[PDB]
Every structure is written in C-alpha cells, then in structure tokens.
C-alpha cells in the first residue's frame, strides 16, 4: 500500500570513466610497429526467433593488419633521448564528496 | 496505493566520460607505424523474427590496413630529443560535490 | 503494506573506472613490435529461440596481424637514453568522502 522504492540503477548497463586518460607513446629509431587495439564496446542483443527462422547476428569487429614486404636501413640508426613526458601533477586539498541518501517514513 | 519511485536509470545504456583524454604521440626516426584502434561503440539490437524469416544482422566494423611493398633508407637516421610533453597540472582545492537524495513520507 | 526498498543496483552491469589511466610506451632501437590488445567489452545477449529456429550469434572480435617478409639493418643500432617519464605526483590532503545512507520508520 506504500512502496517507497529508491534505486539508482534498475536494469542498466553502465561504462563509467571507462578506458580513458592513457598516455600512449612511440619513439622509435626505425621500422617499428605499435598497435593499441582499444575499443570500448557495449551491446545489448535480444534476438527472439520464431518457429522456423534463422537469425545470423554477425556484427564483426576490428581487423588491423600491417604488412611489409621489404624494408631496409643502410646506415646507423641512432636516437639519443634526454627525457620524455616531464609531467608534474599537484592538486589541492580540502575536497569534499558528500553523497547523502536519506529516507523517512512517519505517521 | 502510494508508489514513490525515485530512480536514476531504469532501462538504460550509458557510456559516461568514456574513452577520452588520452595523449597519443608518435615521434619516429623513420618507417614506423602507429595504429590506435579506439572506437567507442554502443548498440541495442532487438531483432525479432517471424515464422520463416531470415535476419542477417551483419553491421561490420573497422578494417585498418597498412601495406608497404618497398621502403629504403640510404643513410643515418638520427633523432635527438631533448624533451616531450612538459605538462604541469596544478588544480586548486576546496571543491565540493554534494549529491543529496532525500525522500519523505508523512501523515 | 509498507515496502521501503532502498537499493543501489538492481539488475545491472557496471564497468566503473575500468581499464584506464595506463602509460603505454615504446622506445625501440629498431624492428620492434608492441601490441596492447586492450578492449573493454560489455555484453548482454538474450537469444530466445522458438520451436525450430537457428540462432547464430557470432559477433567476432579483434584480429590484429603484423607480417614482415624482409627487414634489414646494415649498421649500428645505438640508442642512448638519459631518462623517460619524470613524473611527480603530489596531491593535497584533507579530502573527505562521506557516503551516508540513512533510513527511518516511525509512528
């Protein structure tokens, strides 16, 4: 007769902050391959079939190919590196993250 | 007779802040391949079939190809690097993130 | 007659902060392959079949290939590195993360 229903996710599919904030680098001398296969997928397939049917749910995906028949380097491959990515990350303080979830029945 | 229904996501499919904020770099001497296959997909396929049908749900996807038949380098491949990406990240403080979710029944 | 139902996730599928914040690097002298196969998938397949049907749920996935028929290096492959990724990470204090979940029945 009284159905207080608080909730935050009922029938949900969440990818929060997902697959992010990543320094990818590549500093080669020569003839190098870097591959970062990094998808962020989310699917919800509901394929009901009826009585004689044929469902061919074939979405496919990424195909990354690198071929190289010939590649030469006739001289010295030198690479002097002093430094990379001199990151300084100084955040302040006093941060507050208050997440209050009250509820009240009375008479 | 009284159905207070608070909620935040009922039948949902969320990708929040998803797959972002990423420094990708590539500093080669020569003849290099960088591939960052980075999609952010979201799908919701509902393919009902009836009684004799044929559903061919074939959406396909990314095909990244790199071919190279010949490639030469007759002399020295030098690359002196002092520095890269001198990032300084200084945020302030006192930040407040208040997320209150009250509720009240009375008589 | 009174059904107070607090909840946070009922029938849910969450990937929070998932697969993130990663420094990938590659500093080769030459002829190197780095592959970081890093997807973040989430699926929810509900494939009911009826009475004679054929469901071929074949979504496929990533295919990363690297071929190299020939590759040469006629001279010295030198790579002097002083330093990489001089990261300094100094966050402040006083941080508060209050997550209160009250509830009250009365008469």
Tab-separated table of N, CA and C in Angstrom, chain C residues 32-76:
chain	number	residue	atom	x	y	z
C	32	UNK	N	60.966	-3.422	-33.861
C	32	UNK	CA	60.233	-3.942	-32.725
C	32	UNK	C	58.735	-3.826	-32.930
C	33	UNK	N	57.996	-4.671	-32.224
C	33	UNK	CA	56.543	-4.705	-32.301
C	33	UNK	C	55.997	-4.649	-30.888
C	34	UNK	N	55.199	-3.637	-30.590
C	34	UNK	CA	54.426	-3.614	-29.362
C	34	UNK	C	52.957	-3.702	-29.715
C	35	UNK	N	52.232	-4.591	-29.056
C	35	UNK	CA	50.804	-4.737	-29.270
C	35	UNK	C	50.130	-4.753	-27.917
C	36	UNK	N	49.246	-3.797	-27.673
C	36	UNK	CA	48.485	-3.810	-26.437
C	36	UNK	C	47.028	-4.030	-26.794
C	37	UNK	N	46.612	-5.281	-26.817
C	37	UNK	CA	45.226	-5.622	-27.092
C	37	UNK	C	44.448	-5.311	-25.830
C	38	UNK	N	43.753	-4.183	-25.804
C	38	UNK	CA	43.094	-3.716	-24.587
C	38	UNK	C	41.668	-3.234	-24.856
C	39	UNK	N	40.733	-4.133	-25.132
C	39	UNK	CA	39.341	-3.709	-25.227
C	39	UNK	C	38.700	-3.727	-23.857
C	40	UNK	N	37.594	-3.013	-23.753
C	40	UNK	CA	36.746	-3.089	-22.581
C	40	UNK	C	35.354	-3.367	-23.115
C	41	UNK	N	34.931	-4.609	-23.038
C	41	UNK	CA	33.664	-5.035	-23.595
C	41	UNK	C	32.638	-5.159	-22.484
C	42	UNK	N	31.378	-5.050	-22.872
C	42	UNK	CA	30.266	-5.400	-22.011
C	42	UNK	C	29.155	-5.861	-22.928
C	43	UNK	N	28.567	-7.008	-22.629
C	43	UNK	CA	27.559	-7.579	-23.498
C	43	UNK	C	26.386	-8.023	-22.655
C	44	UNK	N	25.228	-8.139	-23.286
C	44	UNK	CA	24.079	-8.734	-22.613
C	44	UNK	C	23.221	-9.349	-23.712
C	45	UNK	N	23.445	-10.618	-23.978
C	45	UNK	CA	22.793	-11.304	-25.076
C	45	UNK	C	21.669	-12.146	-24.511
C	46	UNK	N	20.471	-11.993	-25.059
C	46	UNK	CA	19.305	-12.749	-24.612
C	46	UNK	C	18.654	-13.303	-25.867
C	47	UNK	N	19.051	-14.496	-26.276
C	47	UNK	CA	18.617	-15.031	-27.559
C	47	UNK	C	17.673	-16.202	-27.333
C	48	UNK	N	16.388	-15.905	-27.191
C	48	UNK	CA	15.384	-16.954	-27.127
C	48	UNK	C	15.146	-17.522	-28.512
C	49	UNK	N	14.995	-18.832	-28.592
C	49	UNK	CA	14.716	-19.495	-29.853
C	49	UNK	C	13.351	-20.154	-29.791
C	50	UNK	N	12.717	-20.279	-30.948
C	50	UNK	CA	11.405	-20.880	-30.988
C	50	UNK	C	11.277	-22.058	-31.926
C	51	UNK	N	11.137	-23.238	-31.349
C	51	UNK	CA	10.456	-24.408	-31.894
C	51	UNK	C	11.063	-25.072	-33.125
C	52	UNK	N	11.765	-24.340	-33.992
C	52	UNK	CA	12.668	-24.954	-34.962
C	52	UNK	C	13.841	-24.066	-35.342
C	53	UNK	N	14.013	-22.903	-34.729
C	53	UNK	CA	14.860	-21.877	-35.298
C	53	UNK	C	16.338	-22.163	-35.171
C	54	UNK	N	17.127	-21.289	-35.779
C	54	UNK	CA	18.580	-21.374	-35.734
C	54	UNK	C	19.101	-19.981	-35.447
C	55	UNK	N	19.666	-19.774	-34.272
C	55	UNK	CA	20.283	-18.504	-33.930
C	55	UNK	C	21.784	-18.680	-33.988
C	56	UNK	N	22.445	-17.914	-34.841
C	56	UNK	CA	23.890	-17.975	-34.972
C	56	UNK	C	24.451	-16.651	-34.482
C	57	UNK	N	24.589	-16.530	-33.177
C	57	UNK	CA	25.101	-15.308	-32.576
C	57	UNK	C	26.615	-15.344	-32.662
C	58	UNK	N	27.175	-14.782	-33.729
C	58	UNK	CA	28.618	-14.828	-33.962
C	58	UNK	C	29.220	-13.439	-34.140
C	59	UNK	N	29.356	-12.642	-33.073
C	59	UNK	CA	29.816	-11.266	-33.268
C	59	UNK	C	31.263	-11.076	-33.665
C	60	UNK	N	32.151	-12.029	-33.459
C	60	UNK	CA	33.539	-11.818	-33.839
C	60	UNK	C	34.245	-10.809	-32.944
C	61	UNK	N	35.526	-10.626	-33.213
C	61	UNK	CA	36.307	-9.757	-32.371
C	61	UNK	C	37.528	-9.261	-33.097
C	62	UNK	N	38.454	-8.704	-32.325
C	62	UNK	CA	39.612	-8.072	-32.917
C	62	UNK	C	40.589	-9.081	-33.479
C	63	UNK	N	41.127	-8.763	-34.646
C	63	UNK	CA	42.159	-9.567	-35.281
C	63	UNK	C	43.275	-8.602	-35.628
C	64	UNK	N	44.341	-8.612	-34.849
C	64	UNK	CA	45.491	-7.765	-35.102
C	64	UNK	C	46.598	-8.644	-35.650
C	65	UNK	N	47.050	-8.349	-36.858
C	65	UNK	CA	48.101	-9.116	-37.500
C	65	UNK	C	49.227	-8.192	-37.909
C	66	UNK	N	50.454	-8.658	-37.744
C	66	UNK	CA	51.634	-7.966	-38.238
C	66	UNK	C	52.487	-8.986	-38.966
C	67	UNK	N	52.713	-8.766	-40.249
C	67	UNK	CA	53.604	-9.606	-41.021
C	67	UNK	C	54.778	-8.767	-41.483
C	68	UNK	N	55.900	-9.425	-41.734
C	68	UNK	CA	57.074	-8.732	-42.251
C	68	UNK	C	57.891	-9.755	-43.016
C	69	UNK	N	57.936	-9.627	-44.337
C	69	UNK	CA	58.678	-10.604	-45.116
C	69	UNK	C	60.179	-10.392	-44.982
C	70	UNK	N	60.650	-9.166	-45.172
C	70	UNK	CA	62.069	-8.879	-45.027
C	70	UNK	C	62.251	-7.575	-44.275
C	71	UNK	N	63.405	-7.452	-43.624
C	71	UNK	CA	63.773	-6.292	-42.824
C	71	UNK	C	65.261	-6.344	-42.517
C	72	UNK	N	65.995	-5.288	-42.839
C	72	UNK	CA	67.440	-5.302	-42.706
C	72	UNK	C	67.902	-4.102	-41.903
C	73	UNK	N	69.115	-4.212	-41.375
C	73	UNK	CA	69.762	-3.143	-40.617
C	73	UNK	C	71.257	-3.287	-40.889
C	74	UNK	N	71.784	-2.433	-41.761
C	74	UNK	CA	73.157	-2.628	-42.206
C	74	UNK	C	74.191	-2.112	-41.216
C	75	UNK	N	73.828	-1.201	-40.315
C	75	UNK	CA	74.817	-0.693	-39.371
C	75	UNK	C	74.357	-0.689	-37.922
C	76	UNK	N	75.129	0.011	-37.095
C	76	UNK	CA	74.955	0.010	-35.653
C	76	UNK	C	73.627	0.637	-35.271
